[model samples]
Target: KVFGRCELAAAMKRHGLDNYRGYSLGNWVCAAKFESNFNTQATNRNTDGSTDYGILQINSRWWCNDGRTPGSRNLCNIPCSALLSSDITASVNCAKKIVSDGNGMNAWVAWRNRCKGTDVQAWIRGCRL
Candidate 1:
C-alpha cells in the first residue's frame, strides 16, 4: 500500500511540470498537497461533523464511487473516489477541472496564482484558486 501522501505529492509535481492540459497540475498539486498531502487514501475526522474522505478532500457520503463497501460512502457519481480505486491521474485531472472551472483559475492562471508565495508544504486554506 502507498500509505503516506509524500509519494502522491511527488507524482503530482511530476505531472504538473508536464502541463497536463485541462487541470492546473501545479495549483491542484499545491492545493492537494496542502489539503491532504496528495494522499488518495486520506480521510479527515472533523469534530464539528464527519470525516472528509479521499483525494481532493471529497466527503464520501456526499460524493460517489462504483464500489460501495459497507462502511464506505458512495462518491463515484462525482468520480472522486476513483483515485482510490482506479488511477490517480484521472482523479487529479478531474479535480483540476473542479478547482479551475467550477472554482475559477484556468490552468495557466492557477499555476501562477498557486505558485505565488506558496511553499511546498504551505497549507492552502481560503485561497480557492
Candidate 2:
C-alpha cells in the first residue's frame, strides 16, 4: 500500500493534486479507498478481460495495458506496471491528462458508484493537507 488516507492526501497535496481541474483531493482520496484501498500494486481484471491498474484503478482498455492485450490505447505511454509502484508520479500525471480530457473523475466507476454523492470529507479528516 502506498499510503494511508492522511498520507495519501498529503502527498497528493504536495503534487499539486489537492485540486486539479476542480476535483478536490478528497474526491480522489475517497475513490482511491474504494477502488484499491490505497494499494499501489492493486490490479483488477475486468469482466471484459481488461484490467485496472494501481491505486486509482485506471482501465487498461483506454489508459494502459500489458502487451498481451490485443487492443490498448496506451494513452499514457506507460507500461501498466509503471503505475503499480510506491511512487505515484506517473499515475498522477496520467490522471491529470484524463481529467483534462473532460471526463473528470467520472472516468472512474468507483467514484461514480461509491463517492459521487457521498460526504467525502471523511477521506481527509485527519490529513493535515
Candidate 3:
C-alpha cells in the first residue's frame, strides 16, 4: 500500500511512533518518505545481501529475519514478511525495537540524512495527531 504523506503521518502517529523514543512523529514520517515513499511492500536488496523491507524499510541484517541474510540477529523476533503488511502495526512495533536496541533514530540512514536535526513538522502538515 502506498500511503499519502499526511495519511502515513497520521497512521504512524496512531500506531505509537509519535515521540516513541525521543523522535517525533514527523521524524518517522520524513524518514519513511525517503526510505520507501510510504510503500508498505517496498524491499531493497543491498549488495551486502541484506534486504530492507516495508514502509520504514527494516533491514534483514539486524531486525527482521528474511531467512537469507548471512548473520541475521532477528532482534525484532518476527519474519521480514510481516513488515510488508498494509496494517503497519507490525512494522511500527519492530521500528520501536530497532531504535531502542541501537543508536536511537540513527538506525536508519534515511532518517540521519533526511530527518535528523531538521525541522520535520512539514511532514505532518495537515495531519492531526
- Evaluated with TM-score, which candidate comes out highest? 3
Query: What C-alpha lDDT values do all the predictions have?
Result: 0.48, 0.85, 0.91
Model 3 TM: 0.95
lDDT of 2 by residue, 1-129 (tens): 668889888877787787799888889899889889999999988887789899889878888867756677899989999989899887888888887887788988989999988888878897676
Which of candidates 1 and 2 reaches a greater lDDT?
Answer: 2
Ten residues in a row with the worst lDDT in model 1?
Answer: 120-129
Worst 10 residues of 3 by lDDT: 120-129
TM-score rank order: 3, 2, 1
Write one digit per residue (lDDT tens) for candidate 1, span 11-120. Answer: 66555632444433445556555455555677665454444545555544444443443355453455444556424665555555544445443322333455544563
For model 3, residues 1-129, the per-residue Cα lDDT tens digits are 999988898888888888998888889999999999999999999989999999999999988999999977898899999999989999999999988975998989999988888889889878766
Off by over 4 Å in 3: none
Candidate 1 CA-lDDT value: 0.48
The parts of candidate 1 lying over 4 Å away from their true place are 1-24, 45-51, 65-81, 105-129
